[PDB]
């Protein structure tokens, strides 16, 4: 596997995040701080060229 | 816990008789023969999934009005001091029985004699009519409707709605029930609540009575933009993909992203559209209708006399001396209040707003040209047929089209949280 | 069942363990049947090891069920009775008012159930935490909890 | 794990694909269609006791 | 559309899709139509990886039969009830002896038409009575059944 | 102490007719509401009183 | 004879007995179906008039 | 919701029944017997048996 799960419906996404709710309605949202990406940047670099 | 059951009939738009004639009544009773048209209304209107129109009934708001007139007329018969029910007609119509279960054509000997001379802006107390006072259930089922009527007849504007916020309402059973509605439209929901209400009239602080109240707030709090997918009320919020469009469709949905912190306490207020373009907004209407069902068993706060026309003041169960005020608004303008708000929270772009506002404009333009045009058609008729004067739609004035308080009430609602 | 029960403590966010409905007393059970009393025992003794956030309520209601006709607790709903099978209280919205406020159970109308209630509140296990792994070199995929 | 603290009992876990600054079609993760917080697994009271 | 020999429909379905090279009476029409009103118009996607609950879409059809079906759906939509309502209902009838359950979580919209007005029930209960009055051999088997 | 008339009456009334009466005593003294007290109970005969919710 | 010779099973326990006896009866959704009929019966009538 | 009955219904408070004669119809049997017994011991009927 690798990305398969993300390809199950409108993969036109922006960012992953996960959360859970309590009976009283309050919820906790965890949004990991995505760092850089060599692959991503390189693609763009070459695209710039 | 309501104890006074009064309602108010409609007034003539400067006419000599109730704004409805035979041709129009026959059209209402076409498929059903009862004057309590809730059910039959909900069918025509068609889940407000497209602009509904007819020859005699051009808009939903028209049928709503007409339905009101028919009751305002016929009901004046059994509510006469003597309480006789089948001795006189009202335009060829007479009651089927003491229990007001339907109208039918008058017997020849009754058609022969004159009709009842109905009056305008009358206020009656159900408990004055035996058959209503003796069978509580019957009363409560029917009142549900007389209320929706009253809520339309108090002012020359649109149907009044009641918005309340109170964390104490949210109980176990409520939470359990609500979750089922995930995915249904405002209409789709209202439709059922109405039916469920008619079968087993709600109690004061009942499970349904509360949830229905909660739904209303959820709708409004979202209609104005205080709540949304990124700032929910206990994860709930109503969604609309085409805000502005002629026929809006709101969906109840979920979101765990955030749940706005709510202030403890109980807060409520009354809202009502003031612009004529309500005759073409199924949600704004049903919203009233629901607050209508609420009234059968619950006593809402009184409405400050100063917010309503003289004729409808000091009505024991409705208008009072030091009550809450009515908050009116123009449909178009609110649309912007809606956008502005979201854009400030950072969930909508300026471009998106423009795209919406633009449409919202085109929509108003259409709805107005039509309403005014049909309005004219009516007068044209009334001059040619002075004996059967009527109105396919509640009368409105050029002034009604302005903003006025729209913004003021836009914040009033936002204050409920 | 024992071992898995433990393994479950680790993936409590995607999997929720519970006691098979079959382990409850047939037809609700009754404090008059010797066999049932044993069912109750076996049950109460094992519930605490399940991740099911409603274990307690079920552990309570079970006896409340068998008690029908001897002791009576008050129901907040005019629909659900004291016979609502226990294995049905699966979510939080079903926790009966008299379960959260023991004070509502009459020591006269239901002396035993009252104790069973106090025992649950006063003695049901208390969660806790423990350090694990080496977060400075391997990092940590914890999401809702500290690394 | 919260014992008798009802209000704080978790009931739903979901994942999100779009960013917090956008309003999209709500597409709840399948993870949320579970009555419990997660997939139900049944154990045998007897054995455990 | 389903079924084979479908490529034909895609042209009767959307007229705004044709090309307009000619000055033919047809092309002229097509050519004068708004471009953007074809195909899917709006949808209600609730579950990631499930069907859309419903979709609005432009395509050939006739306002009349569309309205008819519109009110038909409207009438059924009123008869709809949900699991919880049924749970409650059944539970109430059984007086507690039987306990059933409904799930608690986001559904996928279900159309289950069953709720009708008391009026409707009385009207048929009269029809019902009508065709039996005086003829014993019609009601007896009913009693035996209940017996 | 305040006594629960309802119970008092059933007490004497059950005893005078040789029906089980001892299970009524604990209710002789009012706890908080003369009515509320009985609304719960599953004691004595429905011949004297039964509850219908509130 | 009925009124004279009624007899309950030895160790009867109403709360249980009925819980078994009735269950199956409430697995017959014939009830709901009937509602739909009534629904039509009435549409038929009005359509006639 | 109302269901009429040609008899007095006094819900039972227990789940473990025991013979009970404090019923409406039990008295009826009693009275009927007592009557007969009187018809027999009637000073002007008893001499014939």
Curated annotation (Swiss-Prot), chain B:
Effect of residue 322 to V: In strain: Mutant ts447; temperature-sensitive
Keyword Transport tagged: no
Keywords: Capsid protein, Inner capsid protein, Virion
InterPro entries assigned: Sigma_1_2_reovir (IPR004317)
Consequence of substituting residue 187 to V: In strain: Mutant ts447; temperature-sensitive
Subcellular compartments: Virion
Highest taxon above the source species: Viruses
UniProt entry tagged with the keyword ATP-binding: no
Main location: virion
One GO cellular component term noted in the UniProt record for this chain: viral inner capsid
Remarks, miscellaneous: Mutant ts447 is temperature-sensitive.
Binding partners and assembly: Interacts with protein mu-NS; in viral inclusions.
Protein function: Inner capsid (core) component.
Entry similarity comment: Belongs to the orthoreovirus sigma-1 protein family.
Name of the protein in its database record: Inner capsid protein sigma-2
Native source organism of the sequence: Reovirus type 3 (strain Dearing) (T3D)
Swiss-Prot record, chain D:
Subcellular location: Virion
Position of the signal peptide: none
Segments forming a coiled coil: none
UniProt function note: Inner capsid protein that self-assembles to form an icosahedral capsid with a T=2 symmetry, which consists of 120 copies of VP2, with channels at each of its five-fold vertices. This capsid constitutes the innermost concentric layer of the viral mature particle.
Subunit description: Homodecamer; each decamer is made up of two conformers of VP2, called VP2A and VP2B. 12 homodecamers assemble to form an icosahedral capsid. Interacts with protein mu-NS; in viral inclusions.
Family label: Belongs to the orthoreovirus lambda-1 protein family.
Protein name, as recorded: Inner capsid protein lambda-1
Swiss-Prot record, chain E:
Name by which UniProt lists this protein: Inner capsid protein lambda-1
Portion of the full-length sequence here: 394 to 540 of 1275
Domain of life per record: Viruses
Gene: L3
Coiled-coil residue windows: none
Location in the cell: Virion
Organism the protein comes from: Reovirus type 3 (strain Dearing)
Biological function: Inner capsid protein that self-assembles to form an icosahedral capsid with a T=2 symmetry, which consists of 120 copies of VP2, with channels at each of its five-fold vertices. This capsid constitutes the innermost concentric layer of the viral mature particle. Displays NTPase, RNA 5'-triphosphatase (RTPase) and RNA helicase activities. Helicase activity might be involved in unwinding or reannealing dsRNA during RNA synthesis. RTPase enzymatic activity represents the first step in RNA capping, which yields a 5'-diphosphorylated plus-strand RNA.
Subunit and partners: Homodecamer; each decamer is made up of two conformers of VP2, called VP2A and VP2B. 12 homodecamers assemble to form an icosahedral capsid. Interacts with protein mu-NS; in viral inclusions.
Family in the record: Belongs to the orthoreovirus lambda-1 protein family.
From Swiss-Prot, chain F:
Subcellular location: Virion
Origin: domain of life: Viruses
Function statement: Outer capsid protein involved in mRNA capping. Catalyzes the last 3 enzymatic activities for formation of the 5' cap structure on the viral plus-strand transcripts, namely the RNA guanylyltransferase, RNA-7N- and RNA-2'O-methyltransferase activities.
Family as reported in the entry's similarity comment: Belongs to the orthoreovirus lambda-2 protein family.
Assembly behavior: Interacts with protein mu-NS; in viral inclusions.
Protein name per UniProt: Outer capsid protein lambda-2
Gene responsible for this protein: L2
């Amino acid at each position: 596997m690798l990305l398969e799960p993300l390809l199950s419906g409108d993969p036109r996404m922006t960012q992953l995040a996960i959360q859970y709710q309590q009976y009283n309605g309050r919820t906790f949202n965890v949004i990991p701080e995505m760092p850089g990406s060599v692959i991503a940047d390189c693609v763009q670099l070459t695209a710039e060229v | 816990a309501r104890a006074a059951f009064l309602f108010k009939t409609v007034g003539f738009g400067g006419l000599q008789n109730v704004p409805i004639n035979d041709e129009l009544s026959s059209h209402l009773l076409r498929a059903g023969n009862s004057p309590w048209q809730l059910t039959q209304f909900l069918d025509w209107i068609s889940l407000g999934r497209g602009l509904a129109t007819s020859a005699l009934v051009p808009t939903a708001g028209s049928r709503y009005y007409q339905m009101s007139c028919l009751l305002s007329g016929t009901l004046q018969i059994p509510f006469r001091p003597n309480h006789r029910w089948g001795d006189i007609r009202f335009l060829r119509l007479v009651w089927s029985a003491p229990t007001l279960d339907g109208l039918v054509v008058a017997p020849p000997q009754v058609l022969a004699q004159p009709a009842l001379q109905a009056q305008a802006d009358r206020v009656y107390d159900c408990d004055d009519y035996p058959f209503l006072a003796r069978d509580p259930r019957f009363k409560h089922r029917v009142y549900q409707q007389l209320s929706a009527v009253t809520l339309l007849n108090l002012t020359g504007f649109g149907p009044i709605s009641y918005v309340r916020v109170d964390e104490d309402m949210w109980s176990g059973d409520v939470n359990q029930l609500l979750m089922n509605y995930f995915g249904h439209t405002f209409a789709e929901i209202a439709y059922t609540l109405c039916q469920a209400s008619a079968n087993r009239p709600w109690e004061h602080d009942g499970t349904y009575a509360r949830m229905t109240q909660i739904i209303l707030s959820l709708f409004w709090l979202s209609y104005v933009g205080v709540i949304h997918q990124q700032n929910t009320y206990r994860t709930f919020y109503f969604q609309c993909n085409r805000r502005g469009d002629a026929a809006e469709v709101w969906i109840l949905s979920c979101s765990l992203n955030h749940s706005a912190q709510i202030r403890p306490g109980n807060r409520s207020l009354f809202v009502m559209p003031t612009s004529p373009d309500w005759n073409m907004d199924v949600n704004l209407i049903l919203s009233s209708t629901l607050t209508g069902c609420l009234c059968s068993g619950s006593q809402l706060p009184l409405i400050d006399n100063n917010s309503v026309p003289a004729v409808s003041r000091n009505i024991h169960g409705w208008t009072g001396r030091a009550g809450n005020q009515l908050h009116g608004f123009q449909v178009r303008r609110m649309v912007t209040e809606f956008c502005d708000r979201l854009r400030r929270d950072g969930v909508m772009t300026q471009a998106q707003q423009n795209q919406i506002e633009a449409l919202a404009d085109q929509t108003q333009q259409f709805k107005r040209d039509k309403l005014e045009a049909w309005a004219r058609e009516d007068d044209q008729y009334n001059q040619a047929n002075p004996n059967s004067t009527m109105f396919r739609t509640k009368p409105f004035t050029n002034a009604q089209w302005g903003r006025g308080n729209t913004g003021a009430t836009s914040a009033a609602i936002a204050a409920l949280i | 069942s024992f071992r898995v029960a433990l393994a479950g403590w680790l993936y409590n966010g995607v999997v929720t363990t519970v006691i098979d409905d079959s382990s409850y007393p047939k037809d609700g059970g009754s404090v008059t049947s010797l066999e049932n009393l044993w069912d109750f025992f076996i049950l109460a003794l094992a519930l605490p090891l399940t991740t099911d956030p409603c274990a307690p309520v079920k552990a309570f209601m079970t006896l409340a069920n068998m008690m029908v006709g001897f002791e009576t607790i008050p129901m907040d709903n005019q629909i659900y009775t004291q016979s609502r099978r226990a294995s049905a209280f699966s979510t939080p919205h079903t926790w009966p008012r008299c379960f959260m406020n023991i004070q509502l159970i009459s020591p006269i109308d239901a002396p035993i159930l009252r104790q069973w209630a106090e025992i649950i509140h006063r003695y049901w296990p208390n969660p806790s935490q423990i350090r694990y792994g080496a977060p400075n070199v391997f990092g940590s995929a914890n999401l809702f909890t500290p690394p | 794990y919260v014992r008798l603290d009802r209000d704080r009992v978790p009931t739903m876990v979901g994942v999100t694909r779009q960013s917090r600054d956008t309003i999209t079609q709500p597409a709840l993760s399948l993870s949320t269609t579970n009555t419990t917080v997660g997939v139900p697994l049944a154990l045998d009271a007897r054995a455990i006791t | 559309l389903p079924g084979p020999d479908a490529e034909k429909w895609y042209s009767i379905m959307y007229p705004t899709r044709m090309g307009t090279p000619n000055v033919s009476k047809i092309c002229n029409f097509v050519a004068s139509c708004v471009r953007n009103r074809v195909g899917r118009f709006d949808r209600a996607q609730m579950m990631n990886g499930a069907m859309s609950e419903w979709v609005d879409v432009f395509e050939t059809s006739d306002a009349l039969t569309v309205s008819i079906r519109g009110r038909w759906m409207a009438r059924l939509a009123r008869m709809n009830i949900n699991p919880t309502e049924i749970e409650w209902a059944l539970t109430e009838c059984a007086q507690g002896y039987v306990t059933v359950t409904s799930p608690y979580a986001p559904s996928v919209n279900r159309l289950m038409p069953y709720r009708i007005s008391n009026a409707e029930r009385q009207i048929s209960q009269i029809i019902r009575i009508m065709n039996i009055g005086n003829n014993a051999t019609v009601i007896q088997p009913v009693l035996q059944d209940i017996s | 102490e305040h006594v629960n008339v309802f119970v008092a009456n059933a007490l004497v009334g059950a005893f005078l007719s040789n029906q089980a009466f001892y299970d009524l005593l604990p209710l002789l003294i009012i706890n908080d509401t003369m009515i509320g007290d009985l609304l719960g109970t599953g004691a004595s005969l429905s011949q004297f009183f039964q509850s219908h919710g509130d | 004879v009925a009124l004279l010779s009624g007899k309950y099973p030895p160790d009867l326990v109403t709360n249980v007995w009925y819980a078994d006896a009735i269950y199956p009866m409430y697995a017959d959704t014939e009830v709901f179906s009937n509602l739909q009929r009534d629904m039509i019966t009435c549409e038929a009538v009005q359509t006639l008039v | 919701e109302v269901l009429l009955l040609p008899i007095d219904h006094q819900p039972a408070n227990v789940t473990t029944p025991t013979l009970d004669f404090t019923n409406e119809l039990t008295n009826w049997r009693a009275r009927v017997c007592e009557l007969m017994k009187n018809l027999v011991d009637n000073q002007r009927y008893q001499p014939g048996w």
